[PDB]
């Protein structure tokens, strides 16, 4: 597609202003914490970037990248700064540069993790704005599901 980014585009390569728009979405209801907490450890990022290529249950056997403690450092540092400081922005700044070789997170990995945590506002934004793709499917039950009119 004639999209700005591809599933294989690393988050650090995404325009800072684009990441910022995503950050403000994740700042709501402190959703950045939910995403940060489920980031699988040791993912073959490039292999997991394609649609349906990130098997969450399989990936988590290797554990999670961050702990409840790594999440605090973001809260701590941001709390020292003014109330309008984006914690999601700090979270992504740390995550985007993390890893070594094929460990740097990508747009495709982000999208699938957003879906796993039911962060649909962020996921829809990444799908449409970043990938020019259609919004991901919703579950049948739970807070993320649609409601039909009888």
């Amino acid at each position: 597609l004639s999209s700005k980014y591809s599933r294989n585009t690393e988050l650090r390569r995404v325009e800072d202003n684009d990441i910022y728009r995503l950050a403000k979405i994740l700042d709501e209801n402190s959703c950045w914490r939910k995403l940060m907490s489920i980031i699988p450890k040791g993912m073959d990022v490039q292999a997991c970037s394609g649609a349906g290529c990130l098997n969450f249950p399989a990936e988590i056997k290797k554990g999670f990248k961050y702990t409840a403690q790594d999440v605090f450092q973001i809260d701590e540092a941001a709390n020292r700064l003014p109330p309008d400081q984006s914690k999601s922005q700090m979270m992504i700044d740390e995550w985007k540069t993390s890893g070594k070789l094929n460990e740097r997170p990508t747009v495709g990995v982000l999208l699938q993790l957003l879906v796993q945590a039911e962060l649909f506002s962020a996921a829809d934004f990444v799908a449409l704005d970043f990938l020019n793709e259609s919004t991901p499917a919703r579950p049948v039950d739970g807070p993320g599901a649609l409601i039909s009119l009888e």
Binding site: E28, N29, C31, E118, L119, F120, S121, D124, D141, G142, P143, G144, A145, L146, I147, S148, L149, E150
Partner: protein, 102 residues
């Protein structure tokens, strides 16, 4: 079919009417249970209410904010919980073809 705006985009005036109405009825717990919000989300609403804030507005902040739900989906929720006066308050942001259910 669903060309309605996101709940998060609802103009403040209509949103204030809706929330004031839902708060008076005290149906936030019913709303939260109906969409199966998680314990932390439920507590966040209860918490905001104890602090003198609108319980229903907080519900919209959570359900509409994180899940990016539309006004039509909100209309359907009200319909399921038979909150007809709530449906009427947002009829202008939903297709006229749905006004039959009000």
């Amino acid at each position: 079919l669903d060309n309605t705006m996101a709940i998060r985009l609802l103009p403040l005036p209509v949103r204030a009417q809706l929330c004031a109405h839902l708060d008076a009825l005290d149906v936030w717990q019913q709303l939260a249970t109906a969409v199966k919000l998680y314990p932390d989300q439920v507590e966040q609403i209860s918490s905001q209410k104890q602090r003198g804030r609108s319980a229903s507005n907080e519900f919209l902040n959570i359900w509409g904010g994180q899940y990016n739900h539309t006004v039509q989906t909100l209309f359907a929720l009200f319909k399921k919980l038979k909150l007809h006066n709530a449906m009427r308050l947002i009829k202008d942001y939903v297709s006229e073809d749905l006004h039959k259910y009000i």
